[PDB]
């Protein structure tokens, strides 16, 4: 109802850097908010694409940002009669960036890895890796839980069981409040998908440079399966956390599997042991149901609700004609030991190829009325197709069909304005939460401010 569209702020990365592909609010120990922006195609110091991360401090004027430094040197270790190899070229560092307490976790989903042993190899494959940074101290750690030292043949001999070679760890990421990092790896287990989790604390204390293969004893990976429903499902394309079992002591995980069951797509709700609590099946094939997932209480009853994004959804029209507009599904959580049911509301896009529901961002209580609000991205929406982000205020009955406010891309065609979103953080300290929107195509991030 009250995000100011005129008083914008633009943070700008370098050309072709995809600055704003990912973003998040970050808070230092003193309490000061800044913005973390991931730029997965930033050039390295030797003119090769490695990706990067920038840590912008809040400024009304905005502008250029300082680079959060990471080691971009490839590594080799000849140990245990093998050769371990990291490859950071085209790794896409900052394809996802999440903040927790005084730590930042930027991931390079396409970081490759290989192991040589005599004339044999594990195969050069994108395991992924996350770089962790503690800015006010300067500490750095890594986490690459899909790296192995198993040779190509042994996988073939075991019908590719437990094949983590193509994980793309950090493809998606989230951190629980307690400090459990949760990484989506949709290429895990020959493209079934997997989740890897570990305490941030333990990732740090078990990391040393040069080791490459090491143990985070407290970590917990999800499971391999031979059920064809999960094949090529990209389980973990998106990930989020919330409370869905009544037990405040446990944390529940929401996983996105957009091509699950022959491109029907699904989103699952699991406990921290990766046991299924509920499954939400997609509506229409190839709609990518599960591209985006969001958790927030929108009807003000204290129980978290769930939002799923199917951005390639095709709506029916006159003369049996389908039209790709995108769709967001809202599931309110009921009381007692009751599962999520059918959708409480369906929000469909209006612009063709708009990819409505490509992003879904909880805004907190934007207008301070009691009910939490959200933003839904249509990155190629609006009559011109330059992009659009629609605000939706919450209410007792759930959400509104009619958006409260629409924001149009101030950037040129192609910016993907909306492809990333983050909110529920008061950046300027005026008492109202704000919203940062990314436009990786334009290499920029717009900041919108909430006003009385």
């Amino acid at each position, epitope marked *: 109802l009250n995000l100011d569209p005129v008083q914008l702020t633009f943070y700008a990365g370098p050309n072709g850097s995809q600055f704003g592909f990912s973003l998040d609010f970050h808070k230092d120990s003193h309490g000061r908010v800044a913005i973390v922006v991931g730029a997965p195609r930033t050039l390295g110091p030797s003119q090769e694409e490695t990706g990067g991360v920038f840590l912008c401090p809040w400024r009304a004027e905005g502008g250029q940002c300082p680079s959060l430094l990471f080691d971009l040197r490839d590594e080799t270790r*000849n140990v245990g009669s093998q050769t371990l190899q990291t490859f950071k070229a085209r790794q896409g560092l900052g394809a996802s960036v999440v903040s927790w307490s005084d730590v930042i976790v930027a991931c390079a989903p396409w970081q490759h890895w290989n192991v040589l042993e005599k004339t044999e190899e594990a195969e050069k494959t994108p395991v992924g890796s996350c770089f962790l940074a503690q800015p006010e101290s300067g500490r750095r750690a890594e986490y690459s839980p899909c790296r192995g030292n198993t040779l190509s043949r042994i996988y073939v001999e075991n019908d590719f069981s437990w094949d983590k070679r193509y994980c793309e760890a950090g493809f998606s990421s989230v951190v629980t409040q307690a400090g459990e990092l949760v990484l989506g790896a949709p290429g895990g287990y020959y493209f079934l998908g997997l989740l890897a989790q570990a305490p941030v604390a333990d990732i740090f204390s078990s990391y*040393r440079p040069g080791i490459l293969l090491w143990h985070v004893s407290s970590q917990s990976l999800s499971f391999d399966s031979s059920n064809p429903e999960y094949f090529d499902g990209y389980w973990g394309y998106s990930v989020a956390v919330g409370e869905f079992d009544g037990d405040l002591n446990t944390t529940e995980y929401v996983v996105g599997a957009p091509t699950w069951s022959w491109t029907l797509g699904a989103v699952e709700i699991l406990d921290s042991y990766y046991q299924r609590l509920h499954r939400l099946r997609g509506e229409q094939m190839a709609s990518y149901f599960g591209h985006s997932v969001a958790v927030t209480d929108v009807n003000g009853d204290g129980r978290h609700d769930l939002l799923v994004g199917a951005p390639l959804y095709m709506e029916s029209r006159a003369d049996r004609k389908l039209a790709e507009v995108g769709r967001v599904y809202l599931f309110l959580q009921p009381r007692g030991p009751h599962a999520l049911g059918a959708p409480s509301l369906l929000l469909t896009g209006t612009q063709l190829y708009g990819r409505f529901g490509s992003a879904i961002a909880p805004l907190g209580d934007l207008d301070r009325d009691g009910y939490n609000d959200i933003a839904v991205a249509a990155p190629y929406g609006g009559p011109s197709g330059r992009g659009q982000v629609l605000v939706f205020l919450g209410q007792s009955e759930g959400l509104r069909s009619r958006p409260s406010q629409v924001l149009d891309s101030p950037f040129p065609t192609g910016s993907a304005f909306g492809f990333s979103l983050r909110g529920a953080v008061d950046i300027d300290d005026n008492g109202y939460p704000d919203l940062i929107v990314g436009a990786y195509g334009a290499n920029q991030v717009a900041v919108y401010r909430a006003q009385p």
Partner: antibody, heavy 119, light 108 residues
Framework: EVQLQQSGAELVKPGASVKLSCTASGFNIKDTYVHWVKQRPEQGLEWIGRIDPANGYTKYDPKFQGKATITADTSSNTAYLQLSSLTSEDTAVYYC????????????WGQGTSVTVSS | DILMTQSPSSMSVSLGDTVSITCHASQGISSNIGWLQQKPGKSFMGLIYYGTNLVDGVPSRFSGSGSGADYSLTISSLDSEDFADYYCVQYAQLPYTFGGGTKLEIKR
């Protein structure tokens, strides 16, 4: 608290076999490689081999290939060293070992098991 | 098989001294070296892994150094607890191979 609890001292006969145990406490035996190491006063320390109990795969020093068979059981969290065709050269103290972080390291050791071969 | 020659086999030293043990590999092992301690009659404790990293809980006074095929363990300000045996192990190649040992002994 990581701790490897090895089995008690064995008095055994030449020609016979013995099987030593090493049971994980404060962790699961499948979490890392588990190694076996031989120690004697004069000859010193010798690496016998390793096992990855997740999948049972093993490596050995050619010296002990034929004598030593390393195995493990995730159900009981225990690794095992079996020595066939016992000789007086096998009279040693035997340790199981595992790393802390680095996959390939030798950081945490069991208390050691003494084997005495004698008629 | 890499050979690990450890020097000296024993040294007579006093409390408070800074001593160093050296370990020479038959070929380069790019920091893939651990150092171990065996106290009299007791079992083993890990001191260093990957050349310079202390195992959790090992006191600051222990330190690893070196590169290529030549490495050194340094104990600074010797404690009466530090009069034990010390071994290097390499894990660059299987089979893993150990040093001969160095025994710290009380000078008098």
């Amino acid at each position: 608290e990581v701790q490897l609890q090895q089995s008690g001292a064995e008095l055994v006969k030449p020609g016979a076999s013995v099987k030593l145990s090493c049971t994980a406490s404060g962790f699961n035996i499948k979490d890392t490689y588990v190694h076996w190491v031989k120690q004697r006063p004069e000859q010193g320390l010798e690496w016998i081999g390793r096992i990855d109990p997740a999948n049972g795969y093993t490596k050995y020093d050619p010296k002990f290939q034929g004598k030593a068979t390393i195995t493990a059981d995730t159900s009981s969290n225990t690794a095992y060293l079996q020595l066939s065709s016992l000789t007086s050269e096998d009279t040693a103290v035997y340790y199981c070992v595992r790393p802390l972080y680095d996959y390939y390291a030798m950081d945490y050791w069991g208390q050691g098991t003494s084997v005495t071969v004698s008629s | 098989d890499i050979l690990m020659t450890q020097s000296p086999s024993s040294m007579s030293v006093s409390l408070g001294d800074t001593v160093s043990i050296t370990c020479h590999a038959s070929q380069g092992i790019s920091s893939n070296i651990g150092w171990l301690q065996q106290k009299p009659g007791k079992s083993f404790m890990g001191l260093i892994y990957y050349g310079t990293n202390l195992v959790d809980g090992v006191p600051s006074r222990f330190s690893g150094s070196g590169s290529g095929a030549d490495y050194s363990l340094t104990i600074s300000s010797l404690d009466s607890e530090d009069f034990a045996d010390y071994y290097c192990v390499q894990y660059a190649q299987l089979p893993y191979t150990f040093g001969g040992g160095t025994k710290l002994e009380i000078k008098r």
